[PDB]
């Protein structure tokens, strides 16, 4: 057993039929030493008395908010959560596997620039009693300050007649070096709590590898009796632009003809019912492309 945070603990269990579980001794954080009663969750049933309480934790029915009282007054709280180890593996029932870039991938992170900010999102089929706790750092031996905010619902969709709930969180590196050569990776650690169930997930990466710029800005068409295309860098991309350069790809889409350039403009051939789209990528590093920015042709 170990403490996740104040008055919150985790019990690691080997999850198998008729497993005996672990014996846990809960101590009421209180000065007084007599006339003490324990309870669980909302039930008034007195489970024991005294300074301490011994319990065998083997099923979720044995977990929950253990509370000690003395004269009706609430003295101390102690919440117990369970971490299933199924045949030597921790449980991963909460989050849906994205299977990209590889199996057993639950977290996907991105960054719109080298500023030091980035965003990580994950999916789940759960809708209630769901809580996440996010932490991050650069380096494991000696970690560096990385501040993470709160995880909140970003979208809701249906996939295979079962609802999908997307969560997202924003973080930021305390003292960033946007132009530097990242030597140590970012470490992201997530605690997931569904009811009393405890699970935690992880991801490691450099920022330069997860870059995905925003689509080009102000996409315009200038015809000529065939068409001249022009755009601008996005607002979120890093600055100055002569340092953090971008490259682009122009597509006319029946077929899809594509060209590449480092300029903010290009000339192409337009056709009826066609569409012109453009996306961007870091000019010097092969990171992720940007979503298309489109303008109907003709």
């Amino acid at each position: 057993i170990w403490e996740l945070k104040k008055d919150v603990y985790v019990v690691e269990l080997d999850w198998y039929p008729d497993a005996p579980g672990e014996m846990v001794v809960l101590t009421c954080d209180t000065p007084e030493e007599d006339g003490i009663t324990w309870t669980l969750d909302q039930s008034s049933e007195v489970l024991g008395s005294g300074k301490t309480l011994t319990i065998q934790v083997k099923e979720f029915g044995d977990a929950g908010q253990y509370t000690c009282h003395k004269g009706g007054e609430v003295l101390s709280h102690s919440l117990l959560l369970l971490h299933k180890k199924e045949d030597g593996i921790w449980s991963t029932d909460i989050l849906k596997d994205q299977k990209e870039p590889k199996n057993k991938t639950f977290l996907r992170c991105e960054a719109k620039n080298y500023s030091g900010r980035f965003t990580c999102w994950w999916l789940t089929t759960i809708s209630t009693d769901l809580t996440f706790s996010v932490k991050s750092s650069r380096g494991s031996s000696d970690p560096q300050g990385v501040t993470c905010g709160a995880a909140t619902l970003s979208a809701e969709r249906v996939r295979g007649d079962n609802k999908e709930y997307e969560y997202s969180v924003e973080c930021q590196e305390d003292s960033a070096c946007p132009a530097a050569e990242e030597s140590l990776p970012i470490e992201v650690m997530v605690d997931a709590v569904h009811k009393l169930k405890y699970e935690n997930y992880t991801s490691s990466f450099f920022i330069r590898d997860i870059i995905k710029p925003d689509p080009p800005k102000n996409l315009q068409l200038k015809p000529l009796k065939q068409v001249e295309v022009s755009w601008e860098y996005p607002d979120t991309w890093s600055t100055p632009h002569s340092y953090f350069s971008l490259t682009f790809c122009v597509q006319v889409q029946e077929k899809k003809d594509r060209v590449f350039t480092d300029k903010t403009s290009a000339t192409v051939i337009c056709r009826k019912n066609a569409s012109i789209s453009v996306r961007a990528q870091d000019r010097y590093y092969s990171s992720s492309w940007s979503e298309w920015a489109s303008v109907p042709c003709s």
């Binding site: 080997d14 999850w15 198998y16 039929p17 497993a19 180890k85 199924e86 045949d87």
Partner: peptide, 8 residues
Amino acid sequence: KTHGSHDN
């Protein structure tokens, strides 16, 4: 077979 350490 059950899934777990002490499987049957």
